[PDB]
Nucleic acid binder design. Sequence first.
RNA 1: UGGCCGAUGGGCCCCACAGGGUUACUGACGUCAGCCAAACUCCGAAUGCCGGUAAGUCCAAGAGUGCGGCAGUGAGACGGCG
RNA 2: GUUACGGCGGUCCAUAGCGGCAGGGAAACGCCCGGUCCCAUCCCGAACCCGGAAGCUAAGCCUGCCAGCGCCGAUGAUACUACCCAUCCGGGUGGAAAAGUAGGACACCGCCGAACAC
Lengths: 192, 126, 59, 136, 79
Amino acid sequence: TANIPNKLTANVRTRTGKGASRQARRDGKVPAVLYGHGTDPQHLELNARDFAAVLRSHGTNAILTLDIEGTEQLALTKALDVHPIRRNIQHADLLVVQRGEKVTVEVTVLVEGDATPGTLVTQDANTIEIEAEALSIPEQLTVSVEGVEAGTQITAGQISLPEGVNLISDPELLVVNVVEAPSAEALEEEGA
Amino acid sequence: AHKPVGQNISEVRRNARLRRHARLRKKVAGTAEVPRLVVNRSARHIHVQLVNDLNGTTLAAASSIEADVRAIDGDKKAHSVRVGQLIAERAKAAGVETVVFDRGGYTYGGRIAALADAAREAGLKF
Amino acid sequence: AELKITQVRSTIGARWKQRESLRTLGLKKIRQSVVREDNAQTRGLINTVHHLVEVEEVG
Amino acid sequence: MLIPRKVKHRKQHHPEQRGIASGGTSVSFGDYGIQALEHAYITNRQIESARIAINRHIKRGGKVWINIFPDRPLTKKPAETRMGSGKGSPEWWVANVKPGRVLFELSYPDEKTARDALTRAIHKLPIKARIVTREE
Amino acid sequence: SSSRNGRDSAAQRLGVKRFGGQVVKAGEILVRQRGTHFHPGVNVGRGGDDTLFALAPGAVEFGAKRGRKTVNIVPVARP
RNA sequence: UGGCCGAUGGGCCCCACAGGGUUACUGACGUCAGCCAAACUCCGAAUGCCGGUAAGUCCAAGAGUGCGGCAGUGAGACGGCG
RNA sequence: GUUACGGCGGUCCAUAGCGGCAGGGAAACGCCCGGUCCCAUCCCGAACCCGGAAGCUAAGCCUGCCAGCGCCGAUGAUACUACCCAUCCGGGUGGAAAAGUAGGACACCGCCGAACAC
Ligand SMILES: [Mg+2]
Ligand SMILES: [Mg+2]
Ligand SMILES: [Mg+2]
Ligand SMILES: [Mg+2]
Ligand SMILES: [Mg+2]
Ligand SMILES: [Mg+2]
Ligand SMILES: [Mg+2]
Ligand SMILES: [Mg+2]
Ligand SMILES: [Mg+2]
Ligand SMILES: [Mg+2]
Ligand SMILES: [Mg+2]
Ligand SMILES: [Mg+2]
Ligand SMILES: [Mg+2]
Ligand SMILES: [Mg+2]
Ligand SMILES: [Mg+2]
Ligand SMILES: [Mg+2]
Ligand SMILES: [Mg+2]
Ligand SMILES: [Mg+2]
Ligand SMILES: [Mg+2]
Ligand SMILES: [Mg+2]
Ligand SMILES: [Mg+2]
Ligand SMILES: [Mg+2]
Ligand SMILES: [Mg+2]
Ligand SMILES: [Mg+2]
Ligand SMILES: [Mg+2]
Ligand SMILES: [Mg+2]
Ligand SMILES: [Mg+2]
Ligand SMILES: [Mg+2]
């Protein structure tokens, strides 16, 4: 599993603080900070439009290369600040990383399959923590369900994982639980 | 295979010793003119220091470890009396006469009492 | 150095501390011209009352 | 009919609502959920009605959550009593909400039906809301 | 309908009363704390009601030692 | 609020002194995570206040504190802030 | 001067605690041997105290290693707010958090006293 760099230009922000931050945000540029072992953290602006587009196209996780006045850096996204209402991005964090290093990544998982009439679908956890290489960051996870009955607690560590990744999360965690479907009696019992 | 399921007597003992000395140390405000006389006793030796807490630095001290004092075949009452006399004369040489006594966490009686007396009639008035 | 200070808005209805700082500066009536030393302290004064005064720098 | 079963005291002062909702600002648990927009009260009756609207349509599949819970009491002095003479009695409980909060959370296979049910929930809710998914 | 509440107490006006770095004279009160929010230091007296004062001219000085709060007076140099 | 082993509902279809909710329960603890509080704070500001120093208005505000003669007023309103 | 030693001390007293692992008895430290005499058990030499050094460092202590947990903590942003504003409606300058994040991290140091060396 290998991905493709998502090139994007950026500029060193001129002014630091709420004033410049909000002015840039109104303009349409999100403030951004990158840091790492380079012992040289510094701060830059992005393009909201291309930024959100790339976020969508590559999922929660993506490995990127950044344009700094002609300098090209490799970093992986760590944390974000999404607008509570607007659906816009306030702040992203790019952590410098080189090829051939270990990082901790949380990966989402999707569920698909066929469910029996007496089967109830429930998802306790939508994300799991995994260790992998910089160029081996996935974006989705899938699990197959077919003909499950009664108690079908699916273990997170029971899932089959591609090569090069170690399950950071302990095996005690549960990913998908299937329980007996409720009826009218249970529906009326709950909530009162 | 060792699994601790409780507490330890000697550990709590050392902690308690420090605790109980803490009450007196709390009050003690002993300057250069009135240093604090600290007494430590072991199962095999006794140790005493005279210090001024202002700098946390000692002035004179002695203990059963020194060869000449060990030369005394007697027991720890005699050892304590001799050591206290040494403390008294060393303090006199250094030029300190009036001081305060620290109970050193131990209860008064026996060896501590002998040391206190020896220091008293050795010229050290405290 | 020196500073030219001239009050550009009336003192009325302004915070009491601001009015007193204005008196300290020494501006009695609006649009009075006053010359003052360029110390950090007077600079802070002007910064505080900036919404009432305009500063013209001389020397 | 959610209600705390015991508190230190049966009445609380008027609120301050200023501030952006920080708690639970991002969907987590299921795969879809509502997000309100404007400060407002939400009564236990409103919450229960929305829960009924979601649940009864979804029927068999999927299971829901409720990230909020009405805790703070309220009072209203009965009619025909000149104001004064102490605090009134509590009538309903309400849960506060701030812009950006997530109200309900769903994990059901289909986006279309999830959207439809949550849309009815919106219509039955007292304040604006909109769909939002897990993604970053 | 009638209320059973509505009573209160006086206002003792507690709280620190000479602040750090001030110049205080002998027998001067420093704090009025119900509990031991602070702790005596050299030249400070522990009052009959957990009150703090000074037993010698000087400048009061707060300071944290061993993770508590204790008040103390540094005798200002004699001019 | 939703999950996890859950022995042991700290317990049940035959009570064996021994296998399973062989039975959908209860499940305690804890742990995974997500809120809330004027009488919760393992945290914590801009402000405001008190203390020291220095410049400035220093042909005086008509600045302060004390003492002395003098009366008013102790029915507030509104607006912005909490 | 060294030390794999003991006391007293410090420090906006956890970067200094907890957990697991390994190692110490020359001296000192602990445990330790027995209660005529001091002294004590609301009974007990468990605690203390006292006499002695036969034995051993397992416990405790110490030191060294481990990031399992505590723990400190950036830059940046966000919350917040002093002052001012425009016919509400939020911005301009000033101040700048909490949590989270890279990371840091398995204390440092003072005075005396003990064993090797001068
Ligand atoms: Mg309010
Ligand atoms: Mg309030
Ligand atoms: Mg609504
Ligand atoms: Mg009161
Ligand atoms: Mg959360
Ligand atoms: Mg509070
Ligand atoms: Mg408190
Ligand atoms: Mg106040
Ligand atoms: Mg001052
Ligand atoms: Mg005049
Ligand atoms: Mg008069
Ligand atoms: Mg009069
Ligand atoms: Mg009246
Ligand atoms: Mg009146
Ligand atoms: Mg009135
Ligand atoms: Mg009034
Ligand atoms: Mg009115
Ligand atoms: Mg008003
Ligand atoms: Mg030996
Ligand atoms: Mg015995
Ligand atoms: Mg051992
Ligand atoms: Mg041990
Ligand atoms: Mg901590
Ligand atoms: Mg630690
Ligand atoms: Mg900073
Ligand atoms: Mg204004
Ligand atoms: Mg407006
Ligand atoms: Mg911080």
